[PDB]
C-alpha cells in the first residue's frame, strides 16, 4: 500500500511536487522507485527510474528525489501536455504502485460549442427516435444540461454523461433524449439546454425534415 | 523499436477463464536482461502487479499474493509471446490488462529501469450478459449544423456491448476535426456514442464521408456514409 494524494492542479509555468509515501518494506526498503505518466486511453510511459533517473527523451523539467519513506516527482515550468496520471512504483521482488494523482494544468474559461442532431429517418424506420446533444470545448469541466419539448422541461428519457478530458484540456460531453417515433411526431419543438458558469446555450429541432 | 502487440478487447463470462497473449517483436523473451510482466488498471483499483516470468538460464515465474491462487503466466519461445491465464473470474476483474517488459541495465553500472515498454493494453469486461455489435446511424450535416461554412457530421453507434467501440473516418484519412464522446451506459446496460467531424461545408458535395465502426468484441465492423439532406 502507498498513498499519493489523489488531485494536484498548478498553473503554466509554476512547479508542482507528487508525494509518494509507503513504508520501509516497499519504499524505503531500496531505491528502485520508478514514475509513470498517463494520458487518458494510452499506456503509461516510464519517465523516472530509480528514484532520479531520466530515461532518455523525457525534459528536465521532470525531477526525482527520495527522503525517507517518501519518495517525490517533481514538476518545473507545468505545461499544458504534463496534464496527466502519474505514479509511482517500487521494486521489492514484488511491484507496488501508489494510487495515483491526477495532474491538471490550470487554464481559463471556456464556453461549451454545442450541436443538436435531430433522429435520422434511418432509425425512426426501425421503431427508435435518438436526439443527440453534443457540448464539447468547455472550461471548467460541468455543466448542467436540460431537455424542453415545445418549451416544456423533459426528465423521462434523457441520459448525460459525465465530462470527459479532450486532448486540449477542454471538457467534452454528450446528452441523449430517447423517444418513439410518435412522441418524436407529436412535437413541433425538442431543444437541447446547456449551462456552464453564467451562459446558457440552446439549440433547437422540429420534425419537418 | 520493441514492440508489443496485444490480444485483442473481448468479454469473458463470469467463472471463466481470462486469456490473453502478448506477442514480443523487436526482443527475444528468453532476454537475458528481462522480465515479461503483465499489469492491470481499473478506475477503483489503480495499477495492479500481476506477475512476472524471466528466463536466467531456468525459467521463472513471480505472481501477485492476490492472484497467486487463480493465475498463471506461460512464455511462448516457439512464438516469441507469453501469455495471461486468470481463472474463475468475477467483475472484480474487469480491467484494462497490459503486458510490460522490465528491464535491467547489465552494462558498465546496473541500472533498473521497470516497466520501460508497455502494449497498448486490451479490455476486458466480465460480466453475464452477451456480447453485441453495434447499430450505426448516420447524423447528417443540414443547413442547421453549419456555423458559418462549417458543417457538423457524424455516426450515432448505438446498442452496443461491451466496450470498446474504435471509430476513424474515411479509413483513417480523415482525422483533422474528429471529435469522438466517449460511451453513456443506458439503463438497458447497453452502451451508445457519438462522433462527429467538422468539415467545410462547401465539400459535402464532393467528398464522401465514411465512419468506420469496428466493434473487435462481436467481430464486427460497419462503415456507414454520411450524406447530407
Same mark, same amino acid.
Given at each position: 500500500?502507498?498513498?499519493?494524494?489523489?488531485?494536484?492542479?498548478?498553473?503554466?509555468?509554476?512547479?508542482?511536487?507528487?508525494?509518494?509515501?509507503?513504508?520501509?518494506?516497499?519504499?524505503?526498503?531500496?531505491?528502485?522507485?520508478?514514475?509513470?505518466?498517463?494520458?487518458?486511453?494510452?499506456?503509461?510511459?516510464?519517465?523516472?527510474?530509480?528514484?532520479?533517473?531520466?530515461?532518455?527523451?523525457?525534459?528536465?523539467?521532470?525531477?526525482?528525489?527520495?527522503?525517507?519513506?517518501?519518495?517525490?516527482?517533481?514538476?518545473?515550468?507545468?505545461?499544458?501536455?504534463?496534464?496527466?496520471?502519474?505514479?509511482?512504483?517500487?521494486?521489492?521482488?514484488?511491484?507496488?504502485?501508489?494510487?495515483?494523482?491526477?495532474?491538471?494544468?490550470?487554464?481559463?474559461?471556456?464556453?461549451?460549442?454545442?450541436?443538436?442532431?435531430?433522429?435520422?429517418?434511418?432509425?425512426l424506420q426501425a421503431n427508435k427516435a435518438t436526439l443527440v446533444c453534443l457540448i464539447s470545448d468547455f472550461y471548467p469541466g460541468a455543466v448542467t444540461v436540460a431537455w424542453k419539448a415545445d418549451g416544456s422541461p423533459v426528465k423521462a428519457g434523457v441520459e448525460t454523461t459525465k465530462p470527459s478530458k479532450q486532448s486540449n484540456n477542454k471538457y467534452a460531453a454528450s446528452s441523449y433524449?430517447?423517444?418513439?417515433?410518435?412522441?418524436?411526431?407529436?412535437?413541433?419543438?425538442?431543444?437541447?439546454?446547456?449551462?456552464?458558469?453564467?451562459?446558457?446555450?440552446?439549440?433547437?429541432?422540429?420534425?419537418?425534415? | 523499436?520493441?514492440?508489443?502487440?496485444?490480444?485483442?478487447?473481448?468479454?469473458?463470462?463470469?467463472?471463466?477463464?481470462?486469456?490473453?497473449?502478448?506477442?514480443?517483436?523487436?526482443?527475444?523473451?528468453?532476454?537475458?536482461?528481462?522480465?515479461?510482466?503483465?499489469?492491470?488498471?481499473?478506475?477503483?483499483?489503480?495499477?495492479?502487479?500481476?506477475?512476472?516470468?524471466?528466463?536466467?538460464?531456468?525459467?521463472?515465474?513471480?505472481?501477485?499474493?492476490?492472484?497467486?491462487?487463480?493465475?498463471?503466466?506461460?512464455?511462448?519461445?516457439?512464438?516469441?509471446?507469453?501469455?495471461?491465464?486468470?481463472?474463475?473470474?468475477?467483475?472484480?476483474?474487469?480491467?484494462?490488462?497490459?503486458?510490460?517488459?522490465?528491464?535491467?541495465?547489465?552494462?558498465?553500472?546496473?541500472?533498473?529501469?521497470?516497466?520501460?515498454?508497455?502494449?497498448?493494453? +486490451?479490455?476486458?469486461?466480465? #460480466?453475464? @450478459?452477451? %456480447?453485441? *455489435?453495434?447499430?450505426? =446511424? $448516420?447524423?447528417?450535416?443540414? /443547413?442547421?449544423?453549419?456555423?458559418?461554412?462549417?458543417?457538423?457530421?457524424?455516426?450515432?453507434?448505438?446498442?452496443?456491448?461491451?466496450?470498446?467501440? +474504435?471509430?476513424?473516418?474515411? #479509413?483513417? @484519412?480523415? %482525422?483533422? *476535426?474528429?471529435?469522438? =464522446? $466517449?460511451?453513456?451506459?443506458? /439503463?438497458?446496460?447497453?452502451?451508445?456514442?457519438?462522433?462527429?467531424?467538422?468539415?467545410?461545408?462547401?465539400?459535402?458535395?464532393?467528398?464522401?464521408?465514411?465512419?468506420?465502426?469496428?466493434?473487435?468484441?462481436?467481430?464486427?465492423?460497419?462503415?456507414?456514409?454520411?450524406?447530407?439532406?
Amino acid at each position: 500500500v502507498v498513498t499519493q494524494p489523489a488531485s494536484v492542479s498548478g498553473s503554466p509555468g509554476q512547479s508542482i511536487t507528487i508525494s509518494c509515501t509507503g513504508t520501509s518494506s516497499d519504499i524505503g526498503a531500496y531505491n528502485y522507485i520508478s514514475w509513470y505518466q498517463q494520458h487518458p486511453g494510452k499506456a503509461p510511459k516510464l519517465i523516472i527510474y530509480e528514484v532520479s533517473n531520466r530515461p532518455s527523451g523525457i525534459s528536465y523539467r521532470f525531477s526525482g528525489s527520495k527522503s525517507g519513506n517518501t519518495a517525490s516527482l517533481t514538476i518545473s515550468g507545468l505545461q499544458a501536455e504534463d496534464e496527466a496520471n502519474y505514479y509511482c512504483s517500487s521494486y521489492a521482488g514484488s511491484i507496488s504502485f501508489g494510487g495515483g494523482t491526477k495532474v491538471t494544468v490550470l487554464q481559463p474559461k471556456a464556453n461549451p460549442t454545442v450541436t443538436l442532431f435531430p433522429p435520422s429517418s434511418e432509425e425512426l424506420q426501425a421503431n427508435k427516435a435518438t436526439l443527440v446533444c453534443l457540448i464539447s470545448d468547455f472550461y471548467p469541466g460541468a455543466v448542467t444540461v436540460a431537455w424542453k419539448a415545445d418549451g416544456s422541461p423533459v426528465k423521462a428519457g434523457v441520459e448525460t454523461t459525465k465530462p470527459s478530458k479532450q486532448s486540449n484540456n477542454k471538457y467534452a460531453a454528450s446528452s441523449y433524449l430517447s423517444l418513439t417515433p410518435e412522441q418524436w411526431k407529436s412535437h413541433r419543438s425538442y431543444s437541447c439546454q446547456v449551462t456552464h458558469e453564467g451562459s446558457t446555450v440552446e439549440k433547437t429541432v422540429a420534425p419537418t425534415e | 523499436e520493441v514492440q508489443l502487440q496485444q490480444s485483442g478487447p473481448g468479454l469473458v463470462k463470469p467463472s471463466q477463464t481470462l486469456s490473453l497473449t502478448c506477442a514480443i517483436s523487436g526482443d527475444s523473451v528468453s532476454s537475458n536482461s528481462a522480465a515479461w510482466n503483465w499489469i492491470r488498471q481499473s478506475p477503483s483499483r489503480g495499477l495492479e502487479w500481476l506477475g512476472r516470468t524471466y528466463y536466467r538460464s531456468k525459467w521463472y515465474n513471480d505472481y501477485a499474493v492476490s492472484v497467486k491462487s487463480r493465475i498463471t503466466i506461460n512464455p511462448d519461445t516457439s512464438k516469441n509471446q507469453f501469455s495471461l491465464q486468470l481463472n474463475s473470474v468475477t467483475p472484480e476483474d474487469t480491467a484494462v490488462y497490459y503486458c510490460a517488459r522490465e528491464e535491467q541495465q547489465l552494462v558498465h553500472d546496473y541500472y533498473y529501469y521497470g516497466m520501460d515498454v508497455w502494449g497498448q493494453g +486490451t479490455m476486458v469486461t466480465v #460480466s453475464s @450478459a452477451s %456480447t453485441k *455489435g453495434p447499430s450505426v =446511424f $448516420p447524423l447528417a450535416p443540414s /443547413s442547421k449544423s453549419t456555423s458559418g461554412g462549417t458543417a457538423a457530421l457524424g455516426c450515432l453507434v448505438k446498442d452496443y456491448f461491451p466496450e470498446p467501440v +474504435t471509430v476513424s473516418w474515411n #479509413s483513417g @484519412a480523415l %482525422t483533422s *476535426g474528429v471529435h469522438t =464522446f $466517449p460511451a453513456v451506459l443506458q /439503463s438497458s446496460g447497453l452502451y451508445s456514442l457519438s462522433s462527429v467531424v467538422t468539415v467545410p461545408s462547401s465539400s459535402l458535395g464532393t467528398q464522401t464521408y465514411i465512419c468506420n465502426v469496428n466493434h473487435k468484441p462481436s467481430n464486427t465492423k460497419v462503415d456507414k456514409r454520411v450524406e447530407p439532406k
